[PDB]
Design a protein around this ligand. Structure first.
Ligand SMILES: Nc1ncnc2c1ncn2[C@@H]1O[C@H](COP(=O)(O)OP(=O)(O)OP(O)(O)=S)[C@@H](O)[C@H]1O
Ligand SMILES: Nc1ncnc2c1ncn2[C@@H]1O[C@H](COP(=O)(O)OP(=O)(O)OP(O)(O)=S)[C@@H](O)[C@H]1O
Lengths: 349, 8, 349
C-alpha cells in the first residue's frame, strides 16, 4: 500500500533531528502528491490545485540534508538543481529547461514517469533582488530568474533535447502537476522583520530601546515571517504567490547537537569511528566531551557544519602521529582534550 | 550570443 | 599496498619548506585521510563519510603557494592550481566556476573515476571577499556572488564540462569526494581582530591604556582567529562552514631566513651557484652576509619573495662585468658587500 505521514516521518527522524514542523510539511506534501495524481481524471473535482513548498532556515539547519535523505525512500524521480547557475532569456549560462532535462536522466526518458516527479532547488536567495525596488538595468542572475519560473511552477509546456543535443526533436512535458521544493538561507532577513515588528526606531524617552543581546532571536523571528516581508528582501510577489506554503525552521539547540552526534546513523562520531575501524583502532566519545563541544559550536554561529573545525583541530596531532605508532588498539578523548589543556589518552595492546 | 556588460 | 604516512610526506615538504610545522600537519592529515575515504568502495558500515576541506591563511610570501606546488610532485592522484582572481558569477561574460573542473581532467587524462578522487587548490581567495555593508545598491559579479556559486560545487553536486572544450554534449562528475584547499593572504584581518581582543578605546579615567607596551603581535593575533571574525571581513558564514579546518602561518624570522638559503634545494643561493657553474666560476656565501640580509628583508615587509632584491641589487655591478673577465674561478661575498661599503673579492685561477 501507500505510505503515511507517521511512517515517512519515522524514516526522516533517523537522518534528521530537531526539526518537528519541517518534517510535517514535507510528509503532507508527499502524501498528498500521490492523492492528486491518483485522482487525476477520475475525480469529479477536476483541476486539482497545487501547493509547492518554500523552506527557510539558518545555515547548517538540514535543508540540503532533507532533499538527499528524501530521495533514499522516495519512489518517484527526484533531482537536486541550483538557482545560482540558471540564466534568464537564453544567456551564457544554463536555461530553466535544463532542470527538466536532468529529471529525464534519472527517469530514463520516461515522460509519463517524469511528469509525476519532484524537483528541489537550493540557494534560492541568490536570485533575490538586491534592492526592494525593481532594478533599473537588466539583471542576469536576479529578478529575471523568478520571471521565467512563474509559468513553470503554475504549469507550462517544456522543451527537452532527448539525446545528443542542446538546441530537431522536442518532447512535450506539462508542469502543472510537477512539485517544486525551493529552499535557501535568506541572509539579512532578520533586519527587515525587526523594522516591521519592533517599530521602535527611536532615541527619546517614550521610544523603547531594547536591551542589547536580548532581542530578535532568529528562531522566534522567522516564525513571524509573511510574504510582505520577502518583498522588501527583493523577491517579487508574483513569485511568492506560486509557493503558498512556507516552513520556518529553528536554529540548532545545544541539546540538539549532542543528539545529532549519537542518535543519527551518519553522525560524525560514527564516521570517524569507521575511519579508524579499518586501521585496527577503536574510538570513544564520552558525554563529558559532547556537551562541551556544543558551547564552542554555537559560538561560531555557523551551524552543524561548523563542528568538524572543533573536532579536527583537536585530533590533528593525534591523527598525524597515530599511523606511525604501533600496537594502538583504542583512543579516548576526554573533555579536557577539547579545551586544549590535555592530551588524549592512548591504550596499547 | 548574450553580452553581460556592467560598469561600477 | 602500503600507503605513505604523515611523517614520511612531512619529510618531503620539510625539504622544501621551513618553519611551517603547524601548517604541514594539516596537509598531512588531509592527504592521509583522503586516501582512506577513497580506499572505501562502499564496503564499510559507515555511510556518507565526512569531508574536511582546508583554509590556509598566512602573511605575504610565507610559502602558501609553494606548499601546494611541491605537494603535487610526490602526489600520485591528480592536482591543480586554479586562480580565483578571474572567477566570475556564473551567468556572466568573464568566467564560470566550471572551468576549474576542465583543468583537472587534462591532468587525469579525462578520467572521471580518477578525477573524482583528485585534489584542488585555489589561490588569492581574499580577492573575492567583498568589504562593504549589505549590498542593496548593487550586485557584485566577482564578490559575494562567486562565493555562493562555490557552495554548490562543494558538499556534493553534478556539473557539466565539455569534452576537452568540444557534439553539444557534457560529462557529469560528482564532487562530494573532491577536496578543496583555498588560501589567500587576508589583508587587514589584524585590525578587526584587535577590536575583539583589545576591548577598549581608553579615553576615560578608569579605562586602561597600553598603546605600544601591550600592542598585539600580528603572528600571535592570527592564531586567535575565528569564523565570526571573517564575517566582518566579508566572507559569508555559508562559505566558511564548508571549510571547517583553518591553518594559520607565522611570519618569517631572522633565524628562519638563514635556513631558507641553505637547507632547501631550490634556495636562491644554490640558484646563483649553478648560474656561474656553467661559466666555470665558483660562488660562495659566508654566514656574515646572511645575517645582514635577514635584517634588510624584514624591514621591507615582503617576506621570502623580497630577498632577491637584496641579492641582485648587490651583485649587479659584479654580474655586469663577470663574463668579460677571464681566469676568474671563484667569487667571495663579504658582509661589507651587502652594506655597499666595499666590493666582492674576486679570485683568479
Ligand atoms: N537536523 C540535522 N540533524 C543532523 N545533522 C544535521 C542536521 N542539519 C544539518 N546537519 C548536518 O549538517 C550537514 C549539512 O546540512 P545541510 O542540509 O547542508 O544544511 P543547510 O542549511 O542545507 O546548508 P545550506 O542550505 O547550503 S546554507 C549535514 O550533512 C549534517 O551533517
Ligand atoms: N618556507 C619557505 N622556504 C623557502 N622558500 C620559501 C618559503 N616560503 C616562501 N618561500 C619563497 O617564496 C616564494 C613564493 O612563495 P609563496 O607560496 O608564493 O608564498 P605565499 O604565501 O603563497 O604568497 P602569496 O599567498 O602567493 S601573496 C617561493 O617560490 C620561495 O622562493
Amino acid at each position: 500500500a501507500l505510505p503515511t505521514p507517521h511512517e515517512i516521518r519515522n524514516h526522516l527522524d533517523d537522518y534528521v533531528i530537531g526539526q518537528e514542523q519541517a518534517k510535517k510539511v514535507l510528509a503532507v506534501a508527499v502524501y498528498n502528491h500521490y492523492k492528486r495524481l491518483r485522482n487525476g481524471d477520475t475525480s469529479n473535482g477536476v483541476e486539482l490545485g497545487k501547493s509547492n513548498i518554500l523552506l527557510i532556515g539558518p545555515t547548517g539547519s538540514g535543508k540540503t540534508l532533507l532533499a538527499e535523505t528524501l530521495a533514499r525512500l522516495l519512489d518517484v524521480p527526484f533531482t537536486m538543481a541550483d538557482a545560482t547557475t540558471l540564466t534568464e532569456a537564453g544567456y551564457v549560462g544554463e536555461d530553466v529547461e535544463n532542470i527538466i532535462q536532468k529529471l529525464l536522466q534519472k527517469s530514463d526518458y520516461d515522460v509519463q514517469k517524469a511528469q509525476r516527479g519532484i524537483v528541489y532547488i537550493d540557494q534560492i536567495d541568490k536570485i533575490s533582488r538586491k534592492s526592494d525596488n525593481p532594478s533599473i538595468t537588466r539583471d542576469v542572475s536576479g529578478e529575471g530568474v523568478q520571471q521565467a519560473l512563474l509559468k513553470l511552477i503554475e504549469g507550462t509546456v517544456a522543451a527537452v533535447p532527448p539525446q545528443g543535443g542542446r538546441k530537431q526533436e522536442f518532447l512535450q512535458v506539462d508542469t502543472s502537476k510537477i512539485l517544486f521544493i525551493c529552499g535557501g538561507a535568506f541572509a539579512g532577513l532578520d533586519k527587515v522583520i525587526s523594522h516591521r515588528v519592533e517599530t521602535g526606531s527611536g532615541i527619546g524617552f517614550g521610544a523603547t530601546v531594547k536591551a542589547k543581546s536580548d532581542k530578535a532571536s532568529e528562531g522566534e523571528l522567522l516564525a513571524q515571517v509573511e510574504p510582505e516581508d520577502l518583498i522588501k528582501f527583493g523577491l517579487i510577489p508574483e513569485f511568492i504567490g506560486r509557493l503558498p506554503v512556507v516552513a520556518t525552521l529553528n536554529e540548532l539547540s545545544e541539546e540538539a547537537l549532542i543528539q545529532i552526534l549519537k542518535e543519527p546513523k551518519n553522525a560524525l562520531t560514527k564516521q570517524y569511528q569507521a575511519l579508524f575501524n579499518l586501521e585496527g583502532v577503536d574510538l570513544e566519545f564520552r558525554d563529558e566531551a559532547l556537551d562541551a563541544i556544543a558551547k564552542k559550536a554555537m559560538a561560531r554561529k555557523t551551524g552543524a557544519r561548523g563542528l568538524r573545525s572543533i573536532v579536527e583541530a583537536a585530533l590533528l596531532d593525534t591523527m598525524y602521529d597515530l599511523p606511525s605508532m604501533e600496537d594502538v588498539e583504542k583512543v579516548v578523548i576526554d573533555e579536557s582534550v577539547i579545551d586544549g589543556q590535555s592530551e588524549p589518552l592512548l591504550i596499547y595492546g | 550570443x548574450x553580452x553581460x556588460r556592467x560598469x561600477x
